[PDB]
Design a protein around this ligand. Structure first.
Ligand SMILES: O=C(CCc1ccc2ccc3ncc(-c4cnn(C5CCNCC5)c4)cc3c(=O)c2c1)NCc1ccccn1
Length: 299
């Protein structure tokens, strides 16, 4: 029932939204069919009528019970930040629907297989070790692209990646993503994923591509453990001390030794000493191509 006053938003943000607008008549939000949850609300199945009149299956993000303009602005930015994304391992934006009343709607392509964490946890799907390394390589390529556009993700985790009908892994949620401009960092001004955060980010609240590399390492560990929760016997509040003591996530059972070395490199206490995403793509690609095991998907 909300009425959003657009004159209360930053003009550059409103113009950006206007450019990716979806006509209210072209979208059916299947509001009785929940499919996920972002940082600002739930995600639903949707049907999008395209420019050529074809029905497109989509995922629609909405704001859950809106109270203030700041929340609307952050939610719209989580859609606008994705507008120029064009990479096979990065989810694209289909558009934004803003009706006369109610929450704005961020429209994304539907990803057949759902989130990466749930996919690997499914005992029947049972991805092989090589399949898991391949998923890790795909995420690395998406992050290499994001890093090249000077965006800091800040919330990289398996649950934030999706798999499409061809098993292509795409970095999908950008609810905490920020443009670094020419600064090479983002510091918090205005619910943080503690067990995926770099030690320096937990201490200073400053995020960089190198802090995303740390999160990537944890995502690789989630892959190799088939979606186990990290540090299960460490409380969220005791993580900083645990990490300052030099302690790290242990080698997963079926994980190749060179891939565990890659994870360790991602968690170096000195951010400058961590590999770049370009270096991670090269290293993981060599591990992937030399691991001769059973494999299903195309990486
Ligand atoms: O929700 C999130 C992050 C937010 C986010 C970001 C982008 C997307 C984009 C598309 C999408 N496509 C397909 C399916 C889907 C859902 N199910 N299926 C099929 C249905 C038939 N069975 C096989 C799966 C396809 C779900 C989604 C989403 O909900 C989604 C959600 N992470 C997940 C998360 C969120 C919170 C806690 C844990 N995990």
């Amino acid at each position: 029932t909300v009425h959003i006053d657009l004159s209360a938003l930053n003009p550059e943000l409103v113009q950006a939204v206007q450019h990716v607008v979806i006509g209210p008549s072209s979208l059916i939000v299947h509001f009785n069919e929940v499919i996920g949850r972002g940082h600002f609300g739930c995600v639903y199945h949707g049907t999008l009528l395209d420019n050529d009149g074809k029905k497109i299956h989509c995922a629609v993000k909405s704001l859950n019970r809106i109270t203030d303009i700041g929340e609307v602005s952050q939610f719209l930015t989580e859609g606008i930040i994705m507008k120029d994304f064009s990479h096979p391992n990065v989810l694209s934006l289909l558009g934004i629907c803003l009706r006369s009343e109610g929450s704005p709607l961020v429209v994304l392509p539907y990803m057949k297989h759902g989130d990466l964490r749930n996919f690997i946890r499914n005992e029947t799907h049972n991805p092989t070790v090589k399949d898991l390394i391949g998923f890790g390589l795909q995420v690395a390529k998406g992050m290499k692209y994001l890093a090249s556009k000077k965006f800091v993700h800040r919330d990289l985790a398996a649950r934030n990646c999706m798999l499409d009908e061809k098993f292509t892994v795409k970095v999908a949620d950008f609810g905490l993503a920020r443009d670094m401009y020419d600064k090479e960092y983002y510091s918090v001004h205005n619910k943080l994923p503690v067990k995926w955060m770099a030690l320096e980010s937990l201490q200073t609240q400053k995020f960089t591509t190198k802090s995303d590399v740390w999160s990537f390492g944890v995502l690789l560990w989630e892959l190799m453990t088939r979606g186990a929760p990290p540090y299960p016997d460490v409380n969220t509040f005791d993580i900083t001390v645990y990490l300052l003591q030099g302690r790290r996530l242990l080698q997963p059972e079926y994980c190749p030794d060179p891939l565990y070395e890659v994870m360790l490199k991602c968690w170096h206490p000195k951010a400058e000493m961590r590999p770049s995403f370009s270096e991670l793509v090269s290293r993981i690609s060599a591990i992937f191509s030399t691991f001769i095991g059973e494999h299903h998907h195309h990486h």
